Scaffold this active site. Structure first.
Site, PDB file in Angstrom:
ATOM      1  N   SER A   1      -4.572   1.568 -21.590  1.00 46.08           N
ATOM      2  CA  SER A   1      -4.186   2.953 -21.868  1.00 46.08           C
ATOM      3  C   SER A   1      -4.341   3.786 -20.594  1.00 46.08           C
ATOM      4  O   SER A   1      -4.005   3.314 -19.530  1.00 46.08           O
ATOM      5  CB  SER A   1      -5.022   3.508 -23.031  1.00 46.08           C
ATOM      6  OG  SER A   1      -4.504   4.766 -23.432  1.00 46.08           O
TER       7      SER A   1
ATOM      8  N   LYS B   1      -4.602  -6.176 -25.979  1.00 44.27           N
ATOM      9  CA  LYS B   1      -4.834  -5.958 -27.414  1.00 44.27           C
ATOM     10  C   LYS B   1      -3.747  -6.682 -28.207  1.00 44.27           C
ATOM     11  O   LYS B   1      -2.698  -7.014 -27.653  1.00 44.27           O
ATOM     12  CB  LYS B   1      -4.895  -4.440 -27.761  1.00 44.27           C
ATOM     13  CG  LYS B   1      -3.506  -3.729 -27.854  1.00 44.27           C
ATOM     14  CD  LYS B   1      -3.632  -2.197 -27.897  1.00 44.27           C
ATOM     15  CE  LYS B   1      -2.409  -1.548 -28.619  1.00 44.27           C
ATOM     16  NZ  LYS B   1      -2.378  -1.879 -30.118  1.00 44.27           N
TER      17      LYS B   1
HETATM   18 MG   LIG Z   1      -2.913   5.328 -24.819  1.00 42.61          MG
END
Ligand SMILES: [Mg+2]
Ligand SMILES: [Mg+2]
Ligand SMILES: [Mg+2]
Lengths: 545, 545
Positions: free
Chosen positions: B145, B155
């Site tokens: 992120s 992920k």
């Molecule tokens: Mg993000």
């Protein structure tokens, strides 16, 4: 200018993926038996790209093992100075070298904080170390020079501080290749962490000693007193911190026009072929600095290894031959400790302006074949005060006539342009203009003609009397040379001279051609007549093979 | 803004060495038995940095092997969509994933030409594939992120397209760490070359089908017809090419204010703490785009995984809570095909402006604990029209009431702002201003202090009546909660509310600390009285251990 975007800022689409390329160093391998993937470790070490399977973990492990073995064979038990440039692939290569040298019990000295190190900084460090008289130091420079962002390079500098000659490089090359063929059975390697833990890797500051030592080779005090307005484009290269420390230590009005370090080199303007190439003597690559040329009395730039130099004035980017002649003319008049036993080195494809200058000063000219390697021993023993190549790389001695760097040094050559301007009140381009007024303004060109392998081989083994031409472009031939007049070494080709011009021809290493270098003191049209006749002559000497 | 260079352009000294970091992925190893180096595979998968021995080759090989086994166990035999963002470490991780997935006979689908893929583009690709009804697809997103340039992440998203829940993540985590403890012995792998030649890896264009599909979730014709002047800072993230194609495909007056892809993220302005963080909802990080806010009717940005959104108007950067209330109020009045039963999902610590909005719409509010995971199943089955978190991430349904993305989608939330502006003639900040005039402008704050592990443990395990107070900040308590009123799930802490404000207390998931979130619709002094009384309440209930 060949590419439509030559001279323009690089676009995003021109850039490498740095992380992917570095991964490829580890995840892609040379193909066994594929010659294109093999170690080719020569005058400037081994160069390649991880994405072309020519610069990958196996090559560097192999090379580093080969270098550890040879240095030990040669009785070299002191430290190995390992410097790297700002290319992406220098990072993984650097680590591989530490893993292997440390595993071989080699003491390694590196720039602290993972910094970068110019090629002449490694040369200078070796020389300074070895002048202390103990176990011998040598060095490795991890750089592909000005090659595009996807390339990596690695080369070896023995105890004389200079680039390794073929007597070292050929042995290293073969060992590295046999190690590859053996699946790296014979490579000693420990993990990076073990290497750092071993005690074998010492991090020091190489910058300060080099920067302070510059006062013993360039007249730094004269530069200071002139208060010139200086600019530099570090070109994202290994000596960026060197320029900063120079401006700071010596209190110079020296401005970095950018301070970028970027492994995509995105700040660059595209070279003539549209590549991102950090060529300090290419007008297209130098477009960024050239746009700022009115801001400075004098400005400069260096290629990634900082062994070459580009000199800018408000008149533009100097031609490298032009600056060589000026550097020589100035140095031999402003170095009292360079006595009669100190000569000028010149490669035989360099401008004959050099001959005129050196004759005018009543100094000895030593004409050698193509390549810097021919200056190493003379720089090292102080018999050559200066040796340069027409591709913008040179070195010269300390004030006292002992060596500073026995590899090429771009920093001293830039600072020398500053000392010239400071001491004489005239920038180096104004100096050339005056030379050209005195001796004529030569016109110089390089070209190439198609040749078969058979022809290329024959060109290398001629003798002077196979050239029956008595005249070149309206003048009597004063010399037919197949060996260099200065050191007697073969030139691997041919050079024909008159009083007014010359040509030299040598087989191309990379192509089905031979290369022609030529020059005329009468101008472009006469040079063009030399070109025509040069092909005729060469066509004549080798049409029978 | 705390750091003295917060909001300023990044300097060269702020930047990472990309190639050195990527080398460390291959040459540095996690330490056996060091928990800081272990796989921690959670709500956002596993994140770390190669330089900290927490995101290196062994971790990714181990995780990819664990995922290969788990998906088979769970009945998934279709393809795995593997997408990556623009962090450096996404590149080596991507390669390791392909090596292991192909070795395990997994069929992999990737964006062609080594391109980048938003998280919602993986989610969408999973949904579209599975809607056809053959073997199930799932996916992996390679992203940390908005974390700093040195970080990497990975992920897993199962066939319902959303983030994997703990029933899968804890098994993958335990398995990966088991693999690391066994020196990777059960990892199956082939070379990258073998993987590419196996037929198991297919490269496609994921961009086009996503961009074309947008017409089915956002009113593109309305936006086209309004002819607004739109700006976007792609912030060097995975959807940069998505913005380009949206501009072209829909013929929008939409300008990318920068087109930089740089693994050092050098073009960034520094975040409030002086870090390089690609936080699309942070004023300091968005300083660049904010300086141009006066050039566009509307402008926006996304974080590197493109699951969050930042909305800019000439008034500045919108508060995420504020934008959610507007999005909800607009969508539920402009989506006539959504059933009257389609609900609004709201996290525990989001603004009670949402409650006031949803009540006014006569729609069903489903308040859930912290985390987007609580919205996945309702978005998937179309019972949630919208699910959002206070950290600026959300998703909503296609026009026909079926899911578009079951993970958060920053692109649709940005385009929705343009839809809002086009259809209503007012930008989203203007709409929030109207909401505030109607209900009052709430005052929101978050507090944190240290707590021992024992005090933290107690806080998560309270019973509502353990709060013996009748009033909070001068109003009667209307609810005392240890479970979310919407889905009945444990909140792992405490929420207390009145008609005029609320607070929630929760243990930190990472530190020896607890956090308190509070909000008043009366203003700042009232909110401060809530803060004081919340600390009092939390103190009293944590009076042992
Ligand atoms: Mg993000
Ligand atoms: Mg060079
Ligand atoms: Mg579930």
């Amino acid at each position: 200018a060949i590419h439509n975007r030559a001279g323009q800022p690089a676009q995003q689409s021109d850039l490498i993926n740095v992380a992917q390329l570095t991964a490829q160093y580890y995840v892609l391998k040379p193909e066994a038996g594929n010659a294109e993937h093999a170690v080719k470790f020569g005058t400037s070490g081994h160069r390649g790209s991880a994405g072309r399977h020519s610069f990958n973990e196996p090559h560097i492990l192999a090379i580093a093992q080969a270098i550890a073995e040879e240095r030990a064979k040669n009785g070299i038990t002191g430290p190995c100075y390992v410097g790297k440039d700002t290319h992406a692939l220098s990072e993984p290569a650097f680590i591989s070298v530490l893993e292997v040298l440390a595993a071989n019990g080699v003491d390694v000295i590196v720039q602290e904080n993972n910094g970068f190190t110019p090629t002449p900084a490694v040369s200078n460090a070796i020389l300074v170390h070895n002048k202390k008289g103990g176990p011998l130091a040598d060095g490795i420079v991890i750089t592909p020079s000005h090659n595009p962002p996807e390339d990596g390079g690695i080369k070896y500098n023995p105890p004389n501080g200079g680039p390794a000659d073929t007597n070292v490089t050929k042995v290293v090359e073969d060992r590295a290749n046999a190690l590859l063929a053996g699946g790296l059975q014979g490579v000693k390697r420990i993990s990076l962490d073990a290497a750092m833990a071993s005690g074998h890797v010492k991090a020091v500051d190489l910058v300060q000693p080099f920067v302070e030592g510059l006062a013993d080779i360039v007249d730094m005090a004269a530069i200071q007193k002139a208060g010139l307005t200086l600019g530099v484009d570090p070109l994202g290269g290994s000596g960026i911190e060197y320029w900063k420390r120079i401006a700071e230590h010596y209190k110079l009005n020296l401005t970095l026009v950018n301070d970028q370090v970027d492994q995509t080199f995105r700040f660059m303007h595209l070279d003539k072929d549209g590549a991102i190439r950090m060529d300090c003597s290419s007008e297209c690559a130098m477009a960024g600095l050239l746009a700022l040329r009115d801001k400075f009395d004098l400005a400069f730039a260096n290629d990634p290894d900082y062994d070459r130099h580009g000199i800018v004035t408000p008149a533009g980017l100097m031609n490298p031959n032009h600056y060589l002649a000026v550097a020589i003319n100035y140095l031999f008049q402003h170095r009292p400790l360079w006595g009669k036993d100190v000569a000028v080195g010149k490669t035989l494809v360099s401008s004959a302006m050099i001959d005129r200058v050196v004759n005018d000063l009543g100094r000895k000219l030593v004409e050698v074949p193509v390549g810097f390697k021919w200056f190493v021993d003379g720089l090292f023993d102080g018999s050559f005060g200066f040796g340069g190549e027409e591709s913008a790389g040179a070195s010269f001695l300390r004030f006292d006539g002992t060596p500073w760097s026995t590899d090429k040094d771009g920093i001293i050559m830039c600072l020398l342009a500053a000392e010239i301007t400071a001491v004489t009140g005239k920038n180096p381009q104004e100096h050339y203009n005056e030379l050209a007024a005195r001796f004529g303004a030569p016109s110089y060109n390089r070209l190439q003609a198609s040749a078969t392998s058979a022809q290329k081989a024959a060109l290398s083994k001629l003798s002077p009397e196979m050239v029956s031409a008595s005249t070149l472009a309206g003048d009597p031939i004063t010399a037919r040379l197949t060996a260099a007049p200065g050191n007697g070494a073969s030139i691997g080709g041919l050079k024909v001279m008159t009083d007014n011009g010359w040509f030299a021809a040598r087989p191309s290493g990379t192509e089905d051609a031979y290369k022609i270098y030529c020059e005329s003191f009468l101008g472009e049209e006469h040079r063009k007549q030399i070109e025509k006749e040069a092909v005729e002559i060469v066509s004549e000497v080798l049409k029978n093979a």
